[PDB]
Write a protein that binds this ligand. Structure first.
Ligand code: NI
Lengths: 244, 244, 244, 244
């Protein structure tokens, strides 16, 4: 719907998705660099990734929904929450933002700590198929947490949606870092991979794992656990971007 | 009650308790595996067990109550909050879930990190009886925090029920790892024990300790501190699953 | 007031303070013991002292107020919030709870980990006067947090009072552990000193500092920053325990 | 507006800014001192700086706004939220408070921990230009978090504004400590520099960085993302402290 697409609100929602992924990728990779004076602990990395998401969802969430992740965007598309063009523009803004975020870190990081710019890397003792099942589970819990925390029909105390979602990213890293350095986000993986021109043969896992994981969470959440009562034409209106 | 059991909503609750226990033990055991490149810190593990519950309570709490622990479900039955059949199906789903969680983790962990699959284990310098009193206290504070945070009659600012409950699991880990590897949940102990075919002689401590501790918190909470004005006919109807 | 002190609600409040200080001291000390398998990091101890208070304030706070500290009790008394008899019984229940918690820990901790049972020891390079001004600042920030977070006239979003209060205890340990092992609570120091029967020549700092620190926060909060429109008779009615 | 300044409410607000900055700087620098018994880990320092802000915004926020940072005060001025004289008196009190807080720490810290009193220090492999871009980004995300969390127009669950803001400070520290020891606040840097009469050649970075970074966040938030429908005349009444 070009009337939804050519709006001021839509322009600033696409911009917020660009800026949030820029910041997220900046803080995340910068925390996991191989700083020689003190090599970062898994705890430090899990916390920086989680607190960045938690802060950006709190600050830019009222502007665009604060997806900051192509897997979550595509899951919301599948789960009939956003339009087709919102998904296209958000994903492209997230990928552009991740590249810019990694590029800014590349420019300010000193040579002795920059290394491979914290690109995701599959553990030598784990296979692509093994790692793919892990990324699916890391992203599934994250998406499920997001959908329950942002659902307007929830009546029980929601607490802090932003911090709940943020600490779900921290949780994902406390296991995921051992398998693939933890991605949960195709853009977070693509970002440094473009700046360093370093795409491993396992790069596909970092896209498929999170997308399948979030899509399975959206199917379970929006269609099996808490479905809404919308007519066939109301569901296509949401895809087209002309709903209410 | 055949009306309570043969309900689509009860089937969703049983599946959610299965799914959340599956995801819980996956992350919990996954975080405490003896990873060669970096041996998990105590703070790291305590935070992973705590945030896994914190996330699952936020996500699947609306579906089933977010029990995820046979000891909490038994305390809720003895505290007259749930039916006998709900308690029965819940414990079953949690046990099967814990097994399924440990097995998925088994299929993905690399050989050099698998080890015991994070089974609970008494400290060599502590006795079975000493472990039991520790497990009772660890699970007593967790159940108290749950009962207080989910009480519909609470007029005090509750904050985040999921994060308080989750950080109460982190608290019990900061003390209980040194004694038994921290259980506070019979399903967390049974899960890896079944998958690895490894049961310690102190395995009973991992069932009795948390169950006694949670039941003592239910009697103190629901019968001594904050009782309801309920008649014999209403109390019996809660057990039979026929109440309102 | 015989009408207030002989009541069932008052009996439950005193018990809650004993039980909360029992659990707080058991968790607090048990996290700081010199465990041979892995000596607890400062961040492990700050988080365990902080999460125990946060969890206990959430669980038992609606029963008694979740004082769990003699210094906070006396600050609420001077600030004209609680009665003189309420303060005496709270302080006595807190002192006995701290002794009981320490004793339960003593009989459960193994011989090689038990040691001095996490008693407050002053740093060999800081004078008693330096440690007292530090304990003044430590408890002052905590008390101000408790007052602002539990004021019923507060219109600003309070978030989670329990977690804010508990994370304040964590902050206090990140500075205070270095100076005195961190007290901010006379009963926390009293507890293990009575079980181990070992009182330092600076134990008075652990009473003077916290009390004076909480007291100055009560004078500043309740009389300078946000005073109430209460007549002199209403003030004595509060101390006597006859007010509303 | 001399009547805005000559008000008991303004007297309490300026005192709160002073006291909050005194406490923030004492706790922050104290957590980063080179304590020989155990040298502080990055995770300890980041948490202490963050939890001091979270705690102080929770307690003194209702009194003055809980700015505690000259870059945030100046950013709110540009964003048309505070008067010119409120900005003047807040900044003045923050610098005075930072010096007092650093000076109090000097008076209580043992000689083996004192060192440089945890002043900011440029990493030798980072240029003043690189570290300036870092300080910009660190403070930019913190300001956006504050503006989105304190906006009275927010319809989405804010959760805990204080904890969200505080954990954004921890987040900034998880990256910035490697570049500059993390400033994000001109008063934080000014305090121990004045007390130790030690001003490195890159002290300007710890002013320009945070100020520009927070000012860009204030321009983006109040003028581009969420502008108010006010008239130029009402806008100058805000600058002059006469509006509502
Ligand atoms: Ni460490």
């Amino acid at each position: 719907s070009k009337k939804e697409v050519c709006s001021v609100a839509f322009l600033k929602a696409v911009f917020a998705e660009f800026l949030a992924t820029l910041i997220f990728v900046f803080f995340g990779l910068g925390s996991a660099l191989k700083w020689p004076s003190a090599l970062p602990h898994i705890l430090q990395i899990a916390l920086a990734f989680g607190l960045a998401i938690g802060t950006l969802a709190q600050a830019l969430g009222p502007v665009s929904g604060g997806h900051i992740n192509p897997a979550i965007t595509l899951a919301l598309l599948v789960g009939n929450q956003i339009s087709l063009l919102r998904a296209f523009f958000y994903v492209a803004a997230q990928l552009v933002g991740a590249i810019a975020g990694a590029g800014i870190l590349y420019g300010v990081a000193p040579l002795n700590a920059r290394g491979n710019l914290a690109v995701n890397a599959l553990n030598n003792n784990t296979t692509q198929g093994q790692a793919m099942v892990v990324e699916l589970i890391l992203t599934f819990q994250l998406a499920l947490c997001i959908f329950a925390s942002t659902d307007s029909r929830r009546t029980s105390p929601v607490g802090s949606p932003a911090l709940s979602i943020g600490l779900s990213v921290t949780l994902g890293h406390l296991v995921g870092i051992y398998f693939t350095g933890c991605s949960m986000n195709p853009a977070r993986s693509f970002g440094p991979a473009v700046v360093m021109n370093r795409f491993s043969p396992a790069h596909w896992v970092f896209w498929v794992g999170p997308i399948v994981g979030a899509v399975l969470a959206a199917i379970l959440y929006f269609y099996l656990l808490f479905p809404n009562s919308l007519s066939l034409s109301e569901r296509v209106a949401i895809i087209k971007g002309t709903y209410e």
